[PDB]
Design a protein around this ligand. Structure first.
Ligand SMILES: [Mg+2]
Ligand SMILES: [Mg+2]
Ligand SMILES: [Mg+2]
Ligand SMILES: [Mg+2]
Ligand SMILES: [Mg+2]
Lengths: 273, 284
């Protein structure tokens, strides 16, 4: 059973979320199997950012057991701004564990947009099916975005491939295109671009990419990658890896006893861009 | 100074929010002056629903001193559903006090009776408001919604404390600084009850946002209807509670109605059913 352990108050620099298995912290990058069911291509997704929130929470590749923490820019907490007509992130946003875009690769686990009705929680491990994939170019890096749905979603049986997203969620792909193009403009960064004229490639294509990034991660965790520089490969479930260390689980502090900190009112603002 | 008195937990049937002056409840419908500054057309807006929320909170017409309570549908808490690409309400949503959309006459602009409540207000500024807030706003224009076949004007307004307020003087300025907002507003009020099984709404003037002058004229009309209502001279006041603590010349004035309100009993927000998360895709 997977749960979460929160350190600190939400919306502060001290905030961290670890994934626990049966009460013990494990690596959110390395210890959560990519497949919940390999034969049927059901994946475990680690959720970082709930739909309609702003705080840019991510699995941290540099910290032991890779807890989810809020991204920072020169000491300041990073929040994506509201870009009309969107409110924060427009997907449940996260990543597939045991994947790594070998750097061209963006040096992170492959990103996942989960499109189901229910709002997810930070550190949630949910099971999803892949429907398709888009290739965003962000600052000279290939930044793949897998489109997926929670297998528990009421609509999941009716969704198998990318064309079904058009049928059941008309306009979401357009919005996704737009969002990823403009979402850094309020930060003073340029508009992003997509490969393939912004087309979402189908499930078969998505599976090939996901598989590649899993194989890269297998080389990484085995200690055989060219440059694992700045990535903590500590794990507690893979006994034959060079960086296995069960003691890392017990070194994690206990759950914090703290309410969400307030978010600066500036983050409310709607930008028309 | 206006403050709030909350009874119970948000998102429950017991939840109530009274507006207080000097730590004592007053009627949110009748006792808050329409104008903060009559000469400069600065209005007091009562906020019911914060931007990007769902709970359909409103001034309760039939309850003494008209606290804000969550509306219900056949006994169950009513939440407006998320209609793609929108999340809940896309404005800070509320009303002008001391107004009434008269339900007893056909309004000439829409050829429809009024919806029997205060004139509604869409406040478009950057900061998310809170329920029971009284803020000061300037009117910028107005749209003629027919909501389930009833006259249901929506005033477009901005908080005078918004950084952009000095630059927003008339409806054309909304399109300049908030491009797409008025079109989205038209869409939102057309479609928002489709997930409830209701028909699409419509607008008079093919959804045109009329200007500030037009808005002021309609706000006056609804204020005048309210003056008749509160004097006890409406042909049909619809069981509205007219109790007030500030209008001595009215037959329902009662300073001591305030004392009878229970003390605050604020509890943490109750959880909302996960179904309210759902994003409805209406067309395409
Ligand atoms: Mg990522
Ligand atoms: Mg990426
Ligand atoms: Mg109203
Ligand atoms: Mg209405
Ligand atoms: Mg109304």
């Amino acid at each position: 059973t997977y749960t979460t352990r929160q350190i600190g108050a939400k919306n502060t620099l001290e905030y961290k979320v670890y994934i626990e298995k049966d009460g013990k912290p494990v690596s959110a990058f390395h210890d959560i199997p990519l497949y919940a069911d390999k034969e049927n291509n059901i994946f475990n997704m680690v959720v970082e950012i709930p739909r309609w929130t702003n705080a840019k929470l991510e699995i941290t590749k540099e910290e032991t057991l890779n807890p989810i923490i809020q991204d920072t820019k020169k000491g300041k907490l990073r929040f994506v701004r509201n870009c009309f007509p969107h409110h924060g992130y427009i997907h449940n946003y996260g990543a597939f564990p045991q994947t790594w875009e070998d750097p061209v690769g963006d040096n992170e686990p492959i990103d996942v947009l989960e499109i189901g009705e229910t709002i997810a929680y930070t550190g949630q491990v949910k099971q999803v099916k892949a429907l398709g994939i888009m290739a965003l170019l962000d600052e000279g890096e290939t930044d793949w975005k897998v489109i997926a749905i929670d297998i528990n979603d009421p609509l999941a049986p009716k969704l198998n491939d990318i064309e079904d997203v058009e049928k059941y969620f008309p306009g979401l792909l357009r919005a996704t295109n737009e969002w990823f193009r403009i979402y850094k403009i309020p930060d003073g960064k340029p508009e992003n671009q997509f490969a393939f004229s912004g087309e979402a490639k189908n499930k078969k294509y998505a599976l090939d990419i996901i598989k590649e990034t899993h194989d890269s991660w297998k080389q990484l965790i085995a200690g055989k990658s060219s440059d694992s520089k700045g990535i903590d490969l500590t794990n507690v479930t893979l006994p034959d890896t060079p960086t296995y260390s069960k003691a890392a689980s017990d070194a994690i502090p206990p759950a914090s006893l703290k309410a969400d900190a307030p978010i600066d009112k500036s983050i409310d603002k709607w930008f028309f861009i």
